[PDB]
Paper text:
Signals from the Hedgehog (Hh) pathway are transmitted across the plasma membrane by Smoothened ([name]), a seven-helix transmembrane protein belonging to the G protein–coupled receptor (GPCR) superfamily. Cholesterol binds [name] at two sites: one in the extracellular cysteine-rich domain (CRD) and a second in the transmembrane domain (TMD). In the absence of SHH, PTCH1 inhibits [name] by restricting its access to cholesterol in the membrane of the primary cilium, an antenna-like organelle that projects from the cell surface and functions as a compartment for Hh signaling. Cholesterol can then bind and activate [name], which transmits the signal to cytoplasmic effectors such as protein kinase A. While membrane cholesterol can modulate the activity of many GPCRs, cholesterol plays a unique role in Hh signaling because it is both necessary and sufficient to activate [name].
Numbering used by the authors: 58 to 479, 487 to 657
Amino acid sequence: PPPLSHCGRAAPCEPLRYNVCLGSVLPYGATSTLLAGDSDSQEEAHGKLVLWSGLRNAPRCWAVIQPLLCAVYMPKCENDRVELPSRTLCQATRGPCAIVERERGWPDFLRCTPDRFPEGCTNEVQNIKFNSSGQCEVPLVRTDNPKSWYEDVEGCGIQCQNPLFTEAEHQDMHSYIAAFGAVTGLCTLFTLATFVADWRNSNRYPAVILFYVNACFFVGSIGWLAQFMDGARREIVCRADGTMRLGEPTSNETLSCVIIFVIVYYALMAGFVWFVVLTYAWHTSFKALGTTYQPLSGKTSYFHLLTWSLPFVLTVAILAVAQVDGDSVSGICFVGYKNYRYRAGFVLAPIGLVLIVGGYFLIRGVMTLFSARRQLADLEDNWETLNDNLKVIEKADNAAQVKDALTKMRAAALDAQKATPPDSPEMKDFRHGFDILVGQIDDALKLANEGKVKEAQAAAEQLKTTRNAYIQKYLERARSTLSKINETMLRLGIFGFLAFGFVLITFSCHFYDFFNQAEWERSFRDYVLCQANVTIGLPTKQPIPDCEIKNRPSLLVEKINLFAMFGTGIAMSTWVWTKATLLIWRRTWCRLT
Ligand SMILES: CN[C@H]1CC[C@H](N(Cc2cccc(-c3ccncc3)c2)C(=O)c2sc3ccccc3c2Cl)CC1
Ligand SMILES: CC(C)CCC[C@@H](C)[C@H]1CC[C@H]2[C@@H]3CC=C4C[C@@H](O)CC[C@]4(C)[C@H]3CC[C@]12C
Ligand SMILES: *[C@@H]1O[C@H](CO)[C@@H](O)[C@H](O)[C@H]1NC(C)=O
Ligand code: NA
Ligand code: NA
């Protein structure tokens, strides 16, 4: 109807000093600085407008704030009545201009109070066209897809090429990834090729574990080398709009990111559980030294179950929560790149676990080796003490010599009685055999104490038979069980520890990244906000000053993690660097020629 009394306020009009409000020419000629609390002059108002216009970055917000700001700072005043802006004009900004309520809060007069912004006002800014759609400041890029938007800023996503690192740093990390990826690709393939060439003999535990291990590092390397194909890095890492890929799998985008993610992460996680299977193979290889062999072939089902099933669960679980993200420096897609907390439970947890489990089996194995190796050495020493003191008693002129050699024999026999090979019926006869001998040394000692040297020496000759009838039989068994330890057994443990070291390095890199990522994100937001904040409230004078990023991820750490990941692949590929396999390839060349 004709203008509602509540949709306007009694204020003295002054003619306009600017024909234009934020780019757009105005349909009236008089204004009032009543509606703007912060402004008392028109010139002051205009300067405030120049501060608001730092929201040009944030288009989604800019597009609704422009009309609201005119309606407040440059409102129409006609015949001592100023036109108030409608509620629906003010509320429309609350959503997309949420960065305002975060960074400084909305001023009193821009909060959608019913008194200040009445209901159903014909605003008059609706007749003004605000042509400015708005742009995104570096490192954001303009996009209308809401899945690409960076937090409170809407309309802007992070550029595909990692803003935290220069182009120089990218090609350098890519050179590094190329070197390690390719070499590991060649090493693992060569090593896989030798297994399939001699498949009949190769596919047998524990040597076959290293085949599956090398398979994982081979499949993983493909995923890592993908990016170096012409235009692939951009297809895997960048979105259609030109922002980074984040939160995959997302609906309209291609599968190239999730493909590369599955290739790398599944292969990585399977390789870690195959490593634990290697450390278990090594721990149980010593328990075979017992009467029951306990075959690895029987446990093959349990291995193939865990090694393929567990990565599948983790991969599926990741795909379900949709945490696949791309990175231009690494050139692959992975879990938890953006959301670092998911990287904890899907990368740091499993590696933490394979460290504890694999490490347990590695420690528990060397404990078995060193314990076995010392128990024989100790028995050997006691047995050698017995034989040396028997010679002394044989040669003895007198009782003092005999008593001395016998007390030493006694001590060695009691000590040897304590030893165990690595209430048992075998142990009963072992401990009893020494009980007999100690009791015979006992008898011989009495003769020696009484002075009967020839009697004592005669008694000592019976210890020789007692020794041969029991203790000899068992000492030979102890020697044979430690001889059973082949070089392929120990070589497996050497590889286990060599792999464990790399795992421990990888873990520490991820741990380091996890610990410092939160600051790296904070440092980015502060840099983003700085770019908009520094363009306003600054004199025109010299060029606007560039901002900085406090902190970022360490490329040395990334290069260390890469050396550890690919280094394991290379080290594990040296399992076939033997005489035997040089024969298998030379067998083939003659065949062909
Ligand atoms: C295992 N080694 C990791 C270390 C961390 C590396 N890393 C994490 C990452 C990657 C990609 C995207 C995001 C991300 C996107 C949106 N909001 C917050 C973060 C984070 C980054 O290099 C970047 S890029 C970026 C952009 C903005 C804010 C911080 C930020 C960071 Cl830190 C990857 C390799
Ligand atoms: C990612 C980027 C675009 C977000 C940053 C937008 C910046 C420029 C925004 C956020 C909060 C805004 C401020 C909100 C309130 C006021 C008080 C007013 O009396 C003068 C302008 C001033 C001081 C604004 C200037 C512009 C401002 C600082
Ligand atoms: C701005 O408006 C003019 C007409 O006044 C038009 O030619 C132009 O395309 C508009 N600009 C944008 C970015 O839409
Ligand atoms: Na005022
Ligand atoms: Na997808």
